[PDB]
Every structure is written in structure tokens, then in C-alpha cells.
Amino acid sequence: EKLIAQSCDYKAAYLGSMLIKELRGTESTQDACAKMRANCQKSTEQMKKVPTIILSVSAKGVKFIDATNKNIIAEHEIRNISCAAQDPEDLSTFAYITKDLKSNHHYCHVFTAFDVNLAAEIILTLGQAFEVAYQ
Structure with missing residues (x-):
């Protein structure tokens, strides 16, 4: 349940x-x-x-926890995420779309990373997770 190499944990900015x-x-x-x-x-x-x-993404689900108050913002299955995109010119900013069941809509959750590779990695980790969960 640690998934040290099966999940990635980074500090993003909401x-x-x-x-x-x-x-x-x-x-x-x-x-x-x-x-x-x-x-x-x-x-x-x-x-x-x-x-x-703290943007923690795993192939089993993605969880968003606040870094200041350690607030358990939300833990949603990766299967609830529909797509993951990023800013066309700012590769340090990622925005993914989920199927927010309680909202009956789609929220574009966009976070700004403190590093390009970090953001790009999150995108890849999200995409890979959804891709492997797709099949």
C-alpha cells in the first residue's frame, strides 16, 4: 500500500x-x-x-492532500479521471478532467507544479495509469 515505485508523490500548487x-x-x-x-x-x-x-498519483487512484494543513482534500480513483492535459506553453502547469459524480459535470483540476519535469511526470503517470486501467 506504499507503492513507492508504482506511484509518484509531488508538491503541486492548487x-x-x-x-x-x-x-x-x-x-x-x-x-x-x-x-x-x-x-x-x-x-x-x-x-x-x-x-x-501534495499531488499524489497512483495507478490505483489519485489523492490530493493539502501541504499546509494536511487537509484531506479528496481521494478519487484514477478510473474517475477522464483526461489529463497541460498548458500549451507552460509545461509546468497541468490540468486534468474528471467525472465529478456529485456535480454531474466535469471539473478541470489545474495545478501548477514547481518543476516542468515534475508536471510532465504527473501527466505521464496519470495517462499511464488511465491507459493501463483502460484495458
């Missing part, structure tokens, strides 16, 4: 959970990311800095 009415694929994630990242700043530089959350 940017936002954007509610999507109709899921149009990566468009929704790209839209949320671009719109919000630009809304998060002005004529300023990369002021894209949000609260840290």
Missing part, C-alpha cells in the same frame, strides 16, 4: 478547479488554464503562485 458545463476535451482545460493564468496576473511577470498541495 491553481483552480474550473467548472465545465459541457466537456469539449482539452479545450476546456486549455481555456481554464489560459483564462485563469492570465487573470491571475496583469502587466506583471510570472505571478502564477498558489497554495501548495
Whole structure:
């Protein structure tokens, strides 16, 4: 139940959970990311800095725990995740879509990593997990 090599645990930053009415694929994630990242700043530089959350992703499920208050935000099966995308120009920002059953909608959960490889790894780990769980 440790899955030291079967799961990855990183410190991400919870940017936002954007509610999507109709899921149009990566468009929704790209839209949320671009719109919000630009809304998060002005004529300023990369002021894209949000609260840290421990992004733990496993082939059996993904769990989001707060890094400050260790708040058990949510633990959802990887089978509940539908797709995982990232920002077209910012590979340090990842946004994945889930099937939020209690919402009857799809929330684009976008987090900003503190490292490109870190974010890219999460994307790959999510994709691989969903891919292997698909079959």
C-alpha cells in the first residue's frame, strides 16, 4: 500500500478547479488554464503562485492532500479521471478532467507544479495509469 515505485508523490500548487458545463476535451482545460493564468496576473511577470498541495498519483487512484494543513482534500480513483492535459506553453502547469459524480459535470483540476519535469511526470503517470486501467 506504499507503492513507492508504482506511484509518484509531488508538491503541486492548487491553481483552480474550473467548472465545465459541457466537456469539449482539452479545450476546456486549455481555456481554464489560459483564462485563469492570465487573470491571475496583469502587466506583471510570472505571478502564477498558489497554495501548495501534495499531488499524489497512483495507478490505483489519485489523492490530493493539502501541504499546509494536511487537509484531506479528496481521494478519487484514477478510473474517475477522464483526461489529463497541460498548458500549451507552460509545461509546468497541468490540468486534468474528471467525472465529478456529485456535480454531474466535469471539473478541470489545474495545478501548477514547481518543476516542468515534475508536471510532465504527473501527466505521464496519470495517462499511464488511465491507459493501463483502460484495458
